[PDB]
Paper text:
The ferric iron uptake (Fiu) transporter is a TBDT responsible for import of molecules containing the catecholate functional group. The structure of Fiu consists of a 22-stranded transmembrane β-barrel characteristic of the TBDT superfamily, with a number of extended extracellular loops that might serve in the initial steps of substrate binding. In addition to its role in iron uptake, Fiu has also been shown to be important for sensitivity to antimicrobials that share the common feature of a catecholate functional group or the analogous dihydroxypyridine moiety.
The structure of Fiu was solved in three different crystal forms, revealing Fiu in two distinct states. In contrast, in crystal state 2, the entire polypeptide chain (amino acids 50–760) C-terminal of the TonB box (which is disordered in both crystal forms) could be modeled into the available electron density. The disorder of the plug domain loop in crystal state 1 opens a large cavity in the interior of Fiu to the external environment, whereas, in crystal state 2, this cavity is present but occluded in the lumen of the Fiu barrel. In crystal state 2, removal of the labile subdomain opens the internal cavity of Fiu to the periplasm, but because of the presence of the plug loop, this does not create a membrane-spanning channel. For the first run, the entire extracellular portion of closed Fiu (crystal state 2) was defined as the search area. Specifically, the external plug loop of Fiu in our structures selectively gates a large cavity in the lumen of the transporter.
Numbering used by the authors: 50 to 760
Write the structure that this text describes.
């Protein structure tokens, strides 16, 4: 029987073997784990994979929001898929309608097309079930947290059933003042022909969010903080700022809507061969007003020489954006023999249009903020569109073919080839007559504030990616594998932006090549204790090439090289019928092989990347009524990216977070849960910005009481 903590297979038909027989660093976080841990979003559920989280706060004109996930030494936020379909938006993704999350470390261009040199994160959506029931969850937690979720599956006919997922979350912040997060969701689904060779799945998903965004707090007092100048010397002795202090404005807001319609037709030609066709329309809106703080010598105002009077400048970080994705994906999976060789083929054709428009807004001039006693009770107002927007489009036609050749009962070979034919179009304009950062002068006969185009280009290209693996069953319980993969990210692949050919340092330069990630891997997977526990161990090397670097003369070129090398181990499943365990450890060394240093301390290291990361979670069924759980996360020391800012910590120190759980069940319809997070009320640096002026403090000890009603 399969363990609830270790799902046996990926829901993606692109994966022709179970997790154990898959030649990849794959982790499947189930709905069961999320529910026991009290995880309600992607980031929290991703804590189940070591060295995966939002480790970077942003720059000075921009700050990171939502699931700004860093995995394997780089921002992987653009490589977040829902049902094997790209989902782009600096918004938090809720787990109210996801059955499982699939994480793969080590990219492959064959898997989902263009990607970050990290791997893939895939949120698998809830579909209508054969059985009927209702599931409810009411939650009350620390800092006025409230959560209500409903999961209704109802069978209508012999071959038709409906599914409805409802959600409501209204909360405050336990360790941050004025920060409020409100969201709700509806997810209706209808499936026809269940149990037959013909099936139609129709799904809709709507999420509205109204949040108060946080831009962090001053890094004063942290290890490695120095005063920026002799004039501001006092800052070396004044100490750390109160972690609760909110430096934003009472006008700060973060509003986002998510609308995704999906239509899947599945036809079983035979008990071996099946054809699928998925159509999806999706739109992610997001508009926010945020506050970034600056504390260089030129940003510090000294009214009375007493540090309690001293102020830091405020900089508005705005966003008015829409991400639209229209796609059609055809997939065919067949199992057949070619003599003594068994085949497991997965092939398909995908057509996609991705749109990103950043509606320009008027500059928001914010006043200075007191360092130790900030006043956020100010109203500079919301946003006003100025007509000067950025438009990005990407038309993508991909054709793939994957095969797992079962050579013997003990030997397996597997391959894959994909061709992505793309066309990206980019334009961006700025309102003229401005004063500050990148202000364009108004030409003749052009009235003030008029949009003046700065970029208006396009890029077309082909992307040939491939993969290869071999697996050998040592015992009936354990195997040994090898894998190699090619992944590419073309100019305009990262965020639709492009640059005019022959000039800058941009990877998005239309004359530039894509960034290639070559991944070598040797591993071992083992299914023990009646196949109820999965133990894994891999050695990896991800080489990144065609990175942009400056030549001896001012001019730039793609001679740069990076390497993310390491060791991976993982545990998932049941130890005994009452003992459940999920987790792993990673030793990942991410360095610059060729090129300029990116780390602040001039080391060859890559920033916002822990070298060592550990995550363990266990649950024991103490008695028939009492279940007890515990968790432990270690995130290592990380380098801050290089920057002109003086006296800002060049790095953040490592931290250990511990969690606990205890569940009591009354009858078989009602059960209670109590989750305590950050059990030792440990303080730490969750993330730091590029300049190094601001950091996000570690979430303090927080409680969560849940009522679980099942039918
Ligand atoms: C798994 C063992 C259960 C321990 C229950 C919580 C005990 C930790 O308690 C915390 O310890 C910190 C020092 O470590 C103190 O700074 C905090 O004030 C205190 O709340």
């Amino acid at each position: 029987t399969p363990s609830l903590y270790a799902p046996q297979q990926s829901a993606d038909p692109k994966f022709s073997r179970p997790v154990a027989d898959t030649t990849r660093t794959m982790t499947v976080i189930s709905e069961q784990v999320i529910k026991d841990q009290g995880a309600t979003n992607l980031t929290d559920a991703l804590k189940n994979v070591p060295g995966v989280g939002a480790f970077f706060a942003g720059e000075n004109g921009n700050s990171t929001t939502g699931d700004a996930i860093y995995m394997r030494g780089a921002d992987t936020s653009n490589s977040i898929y829902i049902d094997g379909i790209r989902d782009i938006g600096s918004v938090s993704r809720d787990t109210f309608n996801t059955e499982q999350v699939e994480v793969i470390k080590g990219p492959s261009g064959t898997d989902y097309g263009r990607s970050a040199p990290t791997g893939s994160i895939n949120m698998i959506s809830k579909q209508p079930r054969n059985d009927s029931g209702i599931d409810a969850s009411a939650s009350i937690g620390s800092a006025w947290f409230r959560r209500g979720t409903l999961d209704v599956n109802q069978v209508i006919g012999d071959t038709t059933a409906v599914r409805l997922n409802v959600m409501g979350e209204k909360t405050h912040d336990a360790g941050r003042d004025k920060v409020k997060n409100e969201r709700y969701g509806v997810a209706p689904s209808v499936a026809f022909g269940l149990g037959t060779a013909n099936r139609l799945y129709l799904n809709y998903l709507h999420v509205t969010q109204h949040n108060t965004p946080d831009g962090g707090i001053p890094t004063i007092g942290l290890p490695g903080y120095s005063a920026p100048s002799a004039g501001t010397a006092a800052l070396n002795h004044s100490g750390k700022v109160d972690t609760h202090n909110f430096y934003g404005t009472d006008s700060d807001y973060d509003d986002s809507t998510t609308d995704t319609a999906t239509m899947r037709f599945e036809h079983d030609i035979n008990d071996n061969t099946t054809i699928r066709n998925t159509t999806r329309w999706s739109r992610v809106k997001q508009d926010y007003l945020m506050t970034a703080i600056m504390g260089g010598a030129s940003n510090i105002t000294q009214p009375t020489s007493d540090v309690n009077s001293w102020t830091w400048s405020r900089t508005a970080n705005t966003k008015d954006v829409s991400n639209k994705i229209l796609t059609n994906q055809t997939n065919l999976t067949s199992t057949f023999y070619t003599g003594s060789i068994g085949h497991d083929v997965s092939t398909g054709v995908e057509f996609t249009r991705e749109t990103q428009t950043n509606y320009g807004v008027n500059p928001v001039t914010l006043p200075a903020v007191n360092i130790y006693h900030p006043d956020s009770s100010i109203h500079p107002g919301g946003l006003t569109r100025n007509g000067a927007n950025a438009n990005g489009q990407t038309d993508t036609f991909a054709i793939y073919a994957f095969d797992t050749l079962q050579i013997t009962r003990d030997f397996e070979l597997n391959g894959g080839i994909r061709l992505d034919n793309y066309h990206t179009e980019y334009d961006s304009a700025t309102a003229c007559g401005g004063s500050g950062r990148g202000a364009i002068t108004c030409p003749t006969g052009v009235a003030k504030g008029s949009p003046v185009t700065t970029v208006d280009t396009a890029k077309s290209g082909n992307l040939m990616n491939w993969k290869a693996g071999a697996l050998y069953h040592l015992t009936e319980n354990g195997n040994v594998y090898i894998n190699y993969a090619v992944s590419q990210q073309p100019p305009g692949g990262n965020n639709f932006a492009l640059a005019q050919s022959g000039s800058g340092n941009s990877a998005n330069r239309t004359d530039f090549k894509p960034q290639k990630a070559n991944t070598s891997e040797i591993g071992t997977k083992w299914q023990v204790l009646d196949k109820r526990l999965l133990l894994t161990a891999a050695l990896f090397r991800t080489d990144i090439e065609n990175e942009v670097e400056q030549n001896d003369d001012g001019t730039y070129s793609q001679y740069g090289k990076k390497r993310v090398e390491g060791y991976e181990i993982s545990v998932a499943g049941n130890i005994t019928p009452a003992w459940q365990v999920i987790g792993g450890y990673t030793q990942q060394k991410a360095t610059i092989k060729n090129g300029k240093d990116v780390a602040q301390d001039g080391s060859s290291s890559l920033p916002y990347t822990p070298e060592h990361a550990f995550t363990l979670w266990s649950q024991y069924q103490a008695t028939d009524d009492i279940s007890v759980g515990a968790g432990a996360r270690y995130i290592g020391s990380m380098h801050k990216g290089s920057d002109g800012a003086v006296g800002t910590p060049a790095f953040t120190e490592g931290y250990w977070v511990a969690d606990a759980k205890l569940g009591y069940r009354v009858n078989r319809n009602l059960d209670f849960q109590l989750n305590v997070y950050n059990l030792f009320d440990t303080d730490y640096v969750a993330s730091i910005n590029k300049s190094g002026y601001r950091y996000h403090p570690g979430e303090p000890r927080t409680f969560l009481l849940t009522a679980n009603m099942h039918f």
